[PDB]
Symmetry: C4
Subunit: 302 residues, 4 copies
């Protein structure tokens, strides 16, 4: 009667199962892929948000083995110069975001001319035909440009993005800490099922999946990876750091205030320490082992 | 052993699934049906409550494309005059409510003579034989009058109302924000299952279903429609507005105080903006697409 | 692997389903049975607790159509005299409780000689052999005495009580508002499943089931009856009334303080008004209709 | 798609079912086994934590019929002397913990020479090859030494420990009140399923299982035993007692403050009183009856 496609699971619905292990946390290999052709030293990227990622944060994150996505709420001169700034600070990679509306061609051109490593075409709805069309137009114009498209939350959405020409699929409709999509629209898919459904398709093509939204604790990063993600995208977790664009707070807002957190490097150290522990507990030598072989148990939340 | 008919779902048990879309929010078509023969420009109607709907609110809502139901807790002169007031403010439609007890014939006659577009026969229990009898008596007396009957929460209740002669079925036993039915009586059906069960029957006859109770957020409106409703009836959401009959509050009570909310037009704008977004995300060009083709996922609430 | 007998449901797991009805709340028939041979005008009895039932409350409740159980924490003279007090206030019925330990014979004799209508043999564990033995000894000694035995929470426990000679089975292990059994012992059965399992057996013999514990709201009374109970036993709900043995409170304690509630008659009126409403909504003309024909839906608690 | 091994249950997901009983709480037999060759008078052991167990607590617990595990965060002289202290206070048994890193041989030798009854090889991950290797090395060196290995949370982990030479398997990954494993790593198994899976294997060899972590209330002890554990290990429950190493608190920290609790003997008395009650309710004459024959119901947590 009611058209229910299936049950869907979020981070708090599952735990990872410990397994025989020869991995110690300090020996775990955190290397992974952002896109088909771009490797990362750690599985973390920053959100393309005007309170999270500008050049300073992008530099800090790349030095720690991640990549930042310069947000689009700035002029092209400003966004190209930020790209260039990162590129000259010693062979660092950088991304930049553009919207999916028509008229973005000059922004894309400037970013590409500035040496951007990866273009993110950011949308609240990656399965929208206008998004697919922007990706197809960009891929035709720039046959060798690494392109992330998103966000999707289904197998069919991931397949559509891949067939539009993306280099990586970004997943997340509903899960972000801002919570407006779900409440305002009634649309979303719990993020563990969303990642798995997208990865089920993406794996067939060797296309990485990026898990975007809902990461609160380092345990969520492990679960996101085990569900099939190659890396995670975080906004709230890095907002309020020194590097982000009677107590001290910084603005965090949807594209609210967050308590000051100090320097990004310590946050990243704590988060990856958790991941390293999980890899020791699950016997995962590499991110790929975690992503393809670790097992979950479903829990009640009692 | 225990006589359990089935499991039943409420709004918080489900999310809508994003889908391929050529719909933009500004292009979504919000037109729908209130009854077999009455169209609405937006899928919203107001509750027949003495703290929610009198002439002023009914006028404001009709100007925005909805319809109001003038409550019955007033004399006939008063209720007929309120009907007339709305009708003369420029070709606006209006409803009015009457109780299901015997002796309502003169009230119904006066409302009909005042030009009421739709008569609501309101009951806490639409599957009661006394209600069915009042609907049958009214339908026989006024063969062409649009009549809403309710409330029901089951397939069998919807079928009984239709067989009594209603023009639309109103659903909701248990879900209203007042919460007394469930707590006091132990009776109710979670509203997403209630809407779907009623729509399963009503669809066979082209009879609209009105989802009444439990709408807190614009996301609930989308879900109600996707479960099979043609429009939603709201009480709490409009109570406390300027138009409803050291902080400022208005009474909201069952047939309690609610913080002042300003003008109805802004509320309606925000609520329909959410619905338009959901339609963009689900690829629903029209209310009918959302109502008949969108899909849900079941969630745990973790 | 894990020895799980089945899933079990409490009051908050279920709702009653509305049904076709010719019953109005004021026409509902609240008569029921306490025991095989004792009728009640309403389905309520009071707990045998030293902060709930002495003669004054027992009188008030019997005048409203219920029956009270004089608690045992008093001497025999005191407990017999309390029995007699109720019996002389105009043809009122009364119960009295005794413990299940050996040595209760003189207490039982005195109660029987005082005219007690029903003897309650009260235990936290009715399936204990010592309890069954006390019931068997009492039944042999007093072949015509109405005897309630309890508490049990299973089919097998109900069958054992019946085979020991009880006139009614009292159900409840775990559900009481005091909550110590569950927390301290880890033992219990959710009360809706407990009632149904016990009634499944008891019905085969025409033996009533009394639902004891966990009743918070009048909705719980309806659900208890629909699960198979003939009446409900309440402690917290009547504790703190005028009649029970800078704000005003009375002691409520396990065999804590409760806010003063005024007179018992108003409480009973409100509780039975809820039940009458439920019977109108479910089309239950009599307690037996509710107990044997009404249907539930299972809910998530979202 | 998603690699989910199964659903898993914690203490709050289940209740024990009452059963026919000839057991009174005062007649229940609390004797059990710690290891293959070490009996206990009550099923309780203390955690090897630097805020829970040193000689004073170990003595007090052994006098009540349990055994304590002297923690390792002290020198060998200190840890051997603490062992000796307990051994001379009148034929008391004592355990001691060592880490699983290489270099522990002299610590183990000193503990064994001091008369330690049981060696605990403590790890957050008992299925780690380094742990299995330390157990195998210890078993080869000390063919007759009772050795506890842990912690594991799976059948396969329990089997690995047994095949490494342990005398008892300790279970718990994720359940401890400190909660860091789950949150930081995303790894864990709900403790009732973890105990049952481990006991399913261990039972085949007559090897006891020790349930470690998550015990808050005496009801949890009963459930842990019924799930298959022979005894429980507690940290938080004994931290803050007089004997543990403007209000009064003691440190409780992971290997935080806890309110002062008075003397250990009263805590143990209350906890075992709950267990005795559960055994009366379930008809379990002995710990083995509870561990192998009692039944659970699954509950929703409403
Ligand atoms: O519900 C939303 N309302 C918004 O206004 C919004 N803006 C961004 N995003 C998305 O949230 C992601 C970051 O989520 P977290 O704060 O949980 O890391 C981001 O990376 C986006 O995918 C939004 N989600
Ligand atoms: O539980 C209830 N006790 C009452 O006294 C009551 N009065 C009205 N209604 C119903 O609630 C609907 C409006 O519900 P919301 O405030 O959730 O919009 C209305 O449209 C009615 O269907 C009641 N429900
Ligand atoms: O957990 C418990 N600890 C106690 O000390 C206790 N004493 C009584 N009872 C039982 O609770 C019933 C009344 O429960 P309510 O307050 O929910 O009506 C009573 O009728 C009893 O069945 C107890 N339960
Ligand atoms: O999540 C954890 N973080 C820690 O730092 C930690 N240290 C000890 N343990 C384990 O917790 C057990 C005691 O748990 P309880 O306080 O629940 O009795 C102990 O017996 C250990 O198994 C830890 N768990
Ligand atoms: Cl999608
Ligand atoms: Cl989520
Ligand atoms: Cl109905
Ligand atoms: Cl609902
Ligand atoms: Cl029982
Ligand atoms: Cl219960
Ligand atoms: Cl394990
Ligand atoms: Cl747990």
């Amino acid at each position: 009667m009611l058209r229910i496609a299936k049950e869907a699971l979020t981070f708090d619905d599952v735990l990872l199962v410990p397994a025989h292990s020869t991995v110690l946390p300090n020996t775990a290999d955190l290397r992974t892929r952002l896109t088909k052709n771009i490797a990362l030293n750690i599985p973390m990227v920053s959100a393309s948000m005007d309170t999270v990622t500008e050049a300073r944060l992008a530099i800090a994150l790349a030095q720690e083995g991640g990549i930042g996505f310069i947000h689009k709420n700035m002029s092209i001169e400003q966004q190209a110069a930020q790209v260039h700034q990162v590129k000259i600070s010693g062979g660092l990679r950088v991304g930049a975001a553009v919207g999916a509306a028509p008229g973005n061609e000059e922004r894309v051109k400037a970013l590409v001319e500035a040496g951007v490593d990866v273009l993110l075409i950011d949308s609240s709805h990656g399965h929208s035909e206008g998004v697919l069309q922007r990706i197809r137009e960009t891929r035709a114009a720039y046959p060798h440009l690494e392109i992330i498209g998103g966000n999707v939350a289904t197998a069919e959405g991931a397949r559509a993005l891949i067939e539009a020409g993306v280099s990586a699929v970004k997943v997340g409709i509903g899960p972000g800490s801002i919570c407006t999509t779900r409440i305002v629209t009634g649309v979303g898919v719990p993020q563990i099922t969303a990642i798995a459904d997208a990865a089920g398709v993406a794996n067939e093509y060797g296309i990485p999946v990026i898990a975007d939204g809902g990461i609160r604790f380092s345990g969520d990063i492990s679960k996101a990876i085990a569900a099939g993600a190659s890396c995670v995208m975080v906004g709230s977790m890095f907002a309020g750091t020194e590097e982000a664009p009677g107590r001290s707070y910084k603005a965090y807002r949807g594209m609210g205030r967050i308590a000051y957190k100090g320097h990004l490097k310590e946050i990243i150290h704590q988060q990856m320490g958790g991941l390293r522990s999980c890899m020791g507990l699950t016997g995962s030598a590499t991110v790929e082992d975690l992503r393809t072989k670790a097992q979950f148990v479903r829990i009640s939340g009692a």
